Design a protein around this ligand. Sequence first.
Ligand SMILES: Cc1ncc(COP(=O)(O)O)c(CN[C@@H](CCC(=O)O)C(=O)O)c1O
Ligand SMILES: Cc1ncc(COP(=O)(O)O)c(C=O)c1O
Lengths: 401, 401
Amino acid sequence: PRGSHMVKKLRHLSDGYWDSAARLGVHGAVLQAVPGGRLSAPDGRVAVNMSSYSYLGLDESPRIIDAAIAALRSNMVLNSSLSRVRMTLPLLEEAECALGDLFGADVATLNSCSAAAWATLPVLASGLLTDGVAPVMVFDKRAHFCMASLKSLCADETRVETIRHNDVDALADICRKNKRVAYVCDSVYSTGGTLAPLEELFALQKEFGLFLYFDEAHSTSVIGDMGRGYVLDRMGAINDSTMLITSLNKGFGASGGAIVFGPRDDDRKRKIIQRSSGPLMWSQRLNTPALGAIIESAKLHRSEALPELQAKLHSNIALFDGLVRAAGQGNSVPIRYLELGSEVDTLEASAYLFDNGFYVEPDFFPIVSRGAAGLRARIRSSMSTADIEQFAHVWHKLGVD
Amino acid sequence: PRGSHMVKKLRHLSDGYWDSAARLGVHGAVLQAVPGGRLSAPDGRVAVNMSSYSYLGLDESPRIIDAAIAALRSNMVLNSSLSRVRMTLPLLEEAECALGDLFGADVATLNSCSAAAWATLPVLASGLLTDGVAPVMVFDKRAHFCMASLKSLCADETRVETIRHNDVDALADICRKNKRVAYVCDSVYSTGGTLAPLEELFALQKEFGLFLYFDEAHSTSVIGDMGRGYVLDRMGAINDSTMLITSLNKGFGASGGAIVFGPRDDDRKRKIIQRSSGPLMWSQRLNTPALGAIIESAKLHRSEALPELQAKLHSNIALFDGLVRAAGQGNSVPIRYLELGSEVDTLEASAYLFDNGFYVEPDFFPIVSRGAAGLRARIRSSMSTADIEQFAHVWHKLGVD
Ligand SMILES: Cc1ncc(COP(=O)(O)O)c(CN[C@@H](CCC(=O)O)C(=O)O)c1O
Ligand SMILES: Cc1ncc(COP(=O)(O)O)c(C=O)c1O
């Protein structure tokens, strides 16, 4: 109904930008992964990927890949061949128990974070997770599309309202005028260098019982003790009014996504969502290599390797912040947005850096608003001090301010 | 409607059936995959899975497993670490080129058939796929809920209608009274033992240019040359008013799902869907073992091994139909629905069969309508003549006819 994520019908301007990005080779490239966060082209040239989302370099960990191979060798199937509602392989239960140990919460895996949003948001909107009381579903304007695109489903169940980024004052007003409210947002935003305002949100939760739904896809692993993420690091123990969705193919170094339902010893939320007609019931479970990767990555997150990787990541951020200005400086979030304010210039920049051995993803309309084009750089712990310094060199040679 | 004691009485009823399924052990079981389509419990007791969706038994193919392990070894990463819009691994291109050669069509992979539905249904609803003219979106009542749960997304774009199951009369009427119509249906229904009315549908398409959207999850690999499925077996070459979505974790013996955009030499539908804000743009690509499995399975589907597997499957269907009466008896698709109506009888029957070495999944509400419960058997090529004959023996001891 009212809340919506309409398909873009006017695409002459946007198709022109996509076509140019492909023509310039910054999009549509067939590149091979190569050690050291690098990309190999058909001609043989090698570039450093500055926009990779494996923030801790776990996509290159031989431990994790070996545990994925081992899981497939011993199971000898890619997957079970029934819905998880009927049965699961012991490997799936071991993976979800290992994630539950790490996050300190009841956690289910799904084939993606997007499937996890589809499985949870309509159910949250129905009241079933809020004592039979349909909440007002309040979305942040900059919430990821995996969640925003499902507003119409949420509106089929309750009232959906979208508020301005971090408009805490407006959310409080909605809270004061309604019995039950929920806020759908991203813990770490991939643009603008912003973060979810936890202090005010937790207070509203205390005062009004505001249900908090967070997308931690850029928070898992990169932030917090044992990489539990930004929300759990501040919250400590998850409560019954907070639910988290996340991807495990980024910092965690595995594949798929997950729903952090709440307290580990309360099965009501898992029960409710597992028995609802959505992706957790009828979409394929993660295959056994992915589940092996999850188990090994979880052990690694619980060990002394995670602090070291977060250390090397915070260092590489400081090194980058000392040599290049970008949206976000000293926020300790490994995403830096190189504002260029010009679609044509962002694509030209991207094509230049790539010819110089550095790929930085070009953000243009419709990905970002018009005239707000920029290059999105992601800092990994797997970057060398040289990679970072050698890149700041080539960036200034472009002479953009 | 909420506030109806009935909808709460119905929930207490449904929660009772799900609780019984868990108590009876037909749901919630942790079971290991065992050779020959079998499942092992920790006490060492084993059951034949009469409900596996690996219709050609490819879940146990050593060739596919080996290819999946090899893909992980050579690539040395679980996946790439950017949106596929920026770039892709050569392995992913090899997979999609392989599927494309196999179906004779442009084909993209995604992490699930559900994601394929999410990526395509709103776009078809918008008109961008049908010459700028938003079609009337006509959903069959029994279309799988990965499609049907998204009707609201489509309704925001255009008019959505639901017709009675296989009601080709009602669909033709809609084609007369409207300029452009689309029909969303399953080629082979997930349960209920019914198929799509292809002859009538193809005629309506010739007369009114009706766009046909088919979910081929239970058709892929099961039927047709090179396993191209039910629709393409009868259509021949794909036209530009037909789109197919399918899963590749069932008969194909791999992981993930796929969108069959249409003819191989028209890039428009892929471009439009790839540039829309859905899972094809911002949800993770399949991991490298999954892509290795897709490639090896495609080679398999081109070889003489596929018609051998299809012959064994259809021979097992003939054997089963000669011995057990189920919805779908006589057709050439593996789904056989044993209608029991009562949810109590259905759960008791599944628990009885499971205690006697045969797992048969129980469909009750919300999987199917109330009072329409039943056991969902699925025929697969990995079934022995004795597995089927013995299941028939145990089944008939209940005295249902
Ligand atoms: C007709 C149909 N289309 C799409 C899907 C979704 O496929 P995915 O690729 O997994 O997203 C299903 C799932 N029906 C499966 C449920 C499978 C599972 O949960 O593992 C079934 O056959 O029972 C289906 O039956
Ligand atoms: C914040 C956020 N949430 C969700 C997703 C998608 O997650 P997945 O690929 O697991 O579906 C992304 C990736 O683009 C993301 O950046």
